[model samples]
Target: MQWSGARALEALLTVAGELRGPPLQLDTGQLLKIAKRGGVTAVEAVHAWRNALTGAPLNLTPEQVVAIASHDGGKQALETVQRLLPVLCQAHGLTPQQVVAIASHDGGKQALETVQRLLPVLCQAHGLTPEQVVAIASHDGGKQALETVQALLPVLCQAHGLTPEQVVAIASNGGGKQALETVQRLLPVLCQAHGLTPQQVVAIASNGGGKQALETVQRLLPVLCQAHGLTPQQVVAIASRGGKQALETVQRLLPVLCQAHGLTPQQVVAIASNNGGKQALETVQRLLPVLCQAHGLTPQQVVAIASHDGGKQALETVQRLLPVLCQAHGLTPQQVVAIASNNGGKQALETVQRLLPVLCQAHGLTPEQVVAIASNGGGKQALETVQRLLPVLCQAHGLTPEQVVAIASHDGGKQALETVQRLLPVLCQAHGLTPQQVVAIASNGGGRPALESIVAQLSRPDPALAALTNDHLVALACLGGRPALDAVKKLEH
Candidate 1:
């Protein structure tokens, strides 16, 4: 521990030895070997990391190292972590252990890319345990799951009297991504008047089409339980058949036609999914096999087709598009109908044929692609624009349909791109701005004017001013106007 003596020199050597020995295996002697060959005009994070240590303790352990070494990008993440480990620990008050906790989770290494941003939000804002943070982050839902826990789970447990364990159990335990949103969303409403226990809420969410079932269950119990004299279990059973579509299937049919048709709740739920999709059960008994032959579709696909997209009309649309669109495009009616996932019932039919054959498999566009495009606005016009303009956007700007879809999906997003199609490439090259942040700026309502303001101050001849400008472009876009200007000016001192 002495400052400068034989013992202190020996201490530094042992510390360096342990770093090379068991956990990290980072031989500084080898680093000095490699650091000797620094390229002209280049100092990357990999270089910064090597120079960051002078026999200082990295404050890590074997388990943390095992986690980083365990997965695909674990060691790659540590290359950066090794450099910024002290900054997080001292500057942000995060521990090396917490960083490893993140690095060890599923795809945890990739999560490290945003550790500087999200660690503060996850650790400081939420006050979650390491395991729970890992639990929420491990779900592929990623940000939405984290947001779900923060937004909904807190209320579900705090106000509704469920345990935190119960919240995560139901939130994380389902067949789909966005399980927490699907599960937590239903629990509160289901708990309100329907009176189901937390046990059954998890059970409902655990099944297939969990959102569909939970969504229908919520819609059904309130009206049908009140109007049609059904129990929670009865409604949930019927809910399994379809969503808004099943309700009318039951609402119109179940009341008057049931006893006359000799229909039970099981028969109602089952026959709703069957090819015999009529209010009068007599027709189902009569011609289900024939209807199956006519459509080449299953009861499940039928329910899936009509349930969400305004069911009865959806069923009609399904009938018209049948066999021709199905056999022709090599796509299912379910796939076709979901083309209108947002407002595509009648519009669903309208936009279907426009892009159906246009976006065939060889076109390299998916149904979800059309769905995202159509949902933005102008329906197939938007879809057509995407087909035409997206390639140019991608090839030139290196922005994908994914980023454009995300941008256009935001309020005023498409309008922003539509307005500033010319300036975008310039902004990207000149300032290192992401289209994501740039789109967010325009979507905030000012469009090019706000961006023009940010761009005016983007360049500076001096080093520190330019550095802060690059750092604050995001904040400049994020918090536009005088406030953001004030932030930039304040940092000069």
Candidate 2:
């Protein structure tokens, strides 16, 4: 079709008008009407958008107007996505790669958010597994990752029948605000699962994950605390111990605890982050003697507390206060390395290597149980040994060899092995075996649980049970019922 002279002139005029910068006033209503009629270009719609804003007499910014209209054709974008996504995947079928692309796209993000709203329908339409959906939802698409995750939450909850808490349990990553938002959504459900009172749920939710969120969660905490039958003091005790976020959260709750529960300043100091620096140091020092004498914490406990202070020097400070740790818990070269190097890093690794023999002499960490984790083949030996021992233990426990393999080759590998010790009792119970019987089996060279038992005991809780309050006892009781409880009671008595 040949363009008419007059039509050609009109097009030139439009282009020229844009080049001169938008006019002070614009006929936006007419422009909007035309842009929606279908033949408008991005450039022309943008000019129209600019004119609409500038003419409003409200003096809006050009950037803001451009932003709002940048996707003025977003409806078309949505239509395109609806049309394209299925065709692309229908032939290839869904692959992890394609899912990654769809989730990473802008249109995909919106589609996912919408999908979250109608998740039951969306899941059916996509024919994707819940695990696949979870992967997509949690994929960190850099900036929009959270938006996508938030959008996909409904799908997640629907697929899993997960409450907010269950979802959070699976939340491997998120920032403070995001974590708090999730906790606010999840902890109530988690607490409900635990049969905690409503107030307890609120207090846990108010944990805020960080200082800012803590403040926000704490403000509304009374609603939750009132439900669980918890005192404000208990709430403060749990939340005030981690990051700067924890510091702030705890500080907020401290005074509330002091006034209401008669909690002393010293207890508060131990729980708080020691933010007062030197002053905090002095306060901790002054209280050490009194707490050690009145509380009867063992040399190990005193050393552990000192380790938190200034390492061995702090231990010495404690000894100056009490002077019993040197005799009772006496710092060894290994302990000194552990205290100085600040844990099982390089120095601690070396210390443990040398100290294994001494520890064996002291107790019963047999050479086999304390085998050099740093094998000639390094991590390979560690991996091989764990692999060799885990399934063997499982098989002896009546788990089918395949089932044993599944547990042995669990998803997290070595990390799972470290955790398996805690889970052994539960696993044994599931297989209709008792931990005591397993211990006997371990002792008699009926040895599958033997290696794992060593691991369990090595990595197990080293609680100062005697000092535990009733509520504290309940937490310890979660490890195992009477055995753990009896241990705590015995220590206290």
Candidate 3:
């Protein structure tokens, strides 16, 4: 006889559910909320609704589940089923149970919508069974099957031991529809007759290339597996990771790698992951023994070193000098690694190795100092001319190594060194020209004539133009050409 607001709300919700058996209105969500407010649990609320409507939780019937699921969890599924379930049942020979199951699949909403797009008659015309249709439509990439790959399904599934599920899974890449036809053509020759497995077929199809790349991948995968002794998982992952192009290159790369001291197919995948493709892939393969065998660099370190545009060649150059720099020159393995792991470091190391005798050994410069000089913008050529001219110019003019290194560290640095070494001090002492004037003149584009012009300008110094800025001086020094040179002569006159 007594009632609170919570109980009153629960009674109305229960009565609303009961009226649905006139099966008029199924009050699903509100009953649960109002019942919970009355200290009723979901289980109890669902039970009360069950006796109330002759309906119930996990204990719910199909329509009850579908109806409630339709309200929330099955909203999209409900939409999909309703759209096609009625039209399909009478004319297309489909049942609500089948429709619900198709709409109920994880990919069901998308699958049914795909069915809605194609219509049931066309799906049957393509010879797709309901199960086959659902299987292909259930995957993330399922849309391709309904649109492009549906035509190829019959012939692909008819191949021995190949199911529609396997075919759909294989053809599930964005390009898989374009890619799958080639797979079906290759399957009988490659798998059924030749004994390659369906699983291999599935794995080979797991990439994003078109028909041509797919064909190349199919022909080479089993041979690569047998030749390299790869596991099924490795083959799948490699096929997946390397894409269709990788297999073509990996076949070429394998023999070279097989002879590598301890490199394996598995590690090649890691190297490939680092963009170590084609040329770079080969670099890691060939350099393995030298870097890892004698110097103790790991396979992982080799991958890290060769993962760039220059990495393809730097490791090759670094390998040659590594012994001299690391073993004989006392630089660490890590030291060589750090230097060779850059874009220009490839050529930088190339210049240093050829001059080790004269630069590091004869002059007693350290690898660090030689690399410092060699690794600059134009230091590759800079160090060469330095080797030829540093000792002569330094002794004759008391020119410092820093000044020569600085001179050679630019676009025209190497060419200027010969001018400074062969001609500067002569211009300097006789004309009262300082080394700064010599450096400023030679390091600019003026060259020998540029230096000679300065000597001429100061020939009778205390000449009015004798003291000028480096840029102003070089301008009249022939960097400004004969017109500017003529102007300097006029001033001297």
Candidate 4:
């Protein structure tokens, strides 16, 4: 029998078929090399490799499937992943897929070791569940975040009133755990005393310059509210909307805005009303001094324009249009600023630029009249409403253009005009309030609901209506629903 070395090597590899799943087959050249390397026959070599993988969770060695592999010599790579398989699945109460997902990363074995070491601290000490630990270990920086949670969890949960779950919520986001570390000392104060939840704090901490924001808020929240007379709720509202960096901007600029700039307390509150308000306040703060100097206007003039919903838009528009609107068009800063203070103020300014010339040149309206008309009813919305509804209300409804302007200038003047345009006859029949009165009431804040409630109560004369003040009625209309009903009841008592 002519026994070639290739044939003999193939025969030995075939005998190594103890590997349960796929048949093990090394290349002929590799098998021959193994034989040539030592006195160990091909069968012995293949058998040894097979025996090595016998206890492994996987039927085939993962590395050996393509190229058999491992970590350090204590156990082969297969043994390590395998050893961790049931233990991890049992320990963390994770599915096989989870363990596989976690341990399948580049440094999966090391990650497994880290999890094992950290689990007790997280699970037992911090009250974190095994499942959460698995989740932390599954992240790319899972090990680092996990380690951070171990260090800070006690402080956040025990010292502060954060639950372990809240800590996890903070630790789960990108760079969140680090933010917690930076803001840990301030957490208890914000959470306990100020009524901010962990989530709200994390919101501030997760933004850019979050650490600085947290530190600033920690220092300035009490000062601004207590000394300066802003309510704590108002302070938190500003911070909650703006994030950490924005909160710091608010802190830095709030005093300047109110004191040096001469903005009133109400104006300050308006600028900080919503999430965008914080940034708007900061932008206004930075730009207020410069804008006043450049435009030759009072801080009150700038503050009046910047203290509304479109305050930021108005300020930005002022910056962009200062050259053209004031320089060439000969419009005063007040006129320009007025156009920017409405909802959609930016777009409103653009509309005015295009339409102003038309209104003056074609329709014979003066620029002053145009500015007045544009600034009417919800500012920008009023302008837009006039542009669209002037002809309709004047020609069809017999309302004069001046009447149209009056209707459009209220808070929700745009919506009120549309509602009146559609339902004027119906509204007049149902509510004894004159059409103009209906338009006035509906124009400011409450739209259809205000109209509906006013008409509903006035027409039917609910007994509850007699006891409620006008302000209370408006509040009910604006808030609406059961909460409003509950508020009205509280007020009634």
lDDT of 1: 0.54
TM per prediction: 0.33, 0.22, 0.33, 0.46
Displacement of the residue 316 alpha carbon in candidate 1, Å: 2.0
TM-score-better candidate, 2 vs 3: 3
lDDT of 2 by residue, 32-150 (tens): 44344322553354453445435432233443333223343433333333334454345334443343333333344453454344334335653545444444343322123334345
Q: Candidate 3 on 285-320: residue-level lDDT in tens?
A: 666776787846877678666654456777787777
* Cα lDDT of model 1 by residue, 1-493, tens digit: 3243454555445444554554346555443332233211111223234323333657555434444444444345556566666776786665667666655544443555554556556566666564665555443333445556666655666766666666555445223345556766667767766788766666665434567667767766678877877777666555543434555567777764456544455556554542223332333433334445574555444434433424444455555665556676566655654543333354555665667667645456666655555543335545554556667777876666666655444334445456446667667788787777766665554454556656666654333355655556666666674356546567675
For residues 336-411, could you state the per-residue lDDT of candidate 4 as single tens digits?
7777766566777777777777766654456876787567434556666667777777777666655666556556
The whole-model C-alpha lDDT of candidate 2 against the native structure comes to 0.40
- Best candidate, lDDT: 4
Stretches of candidate 2 exceeding 4 Å from the true structure: 1-212, 215-245, 248-325, 328-337, 340-493
Alpha-carbon lDDT, every model: 0.54, 0.40, 0.59, 0.62
Error of 1 at 141 (Å): 44
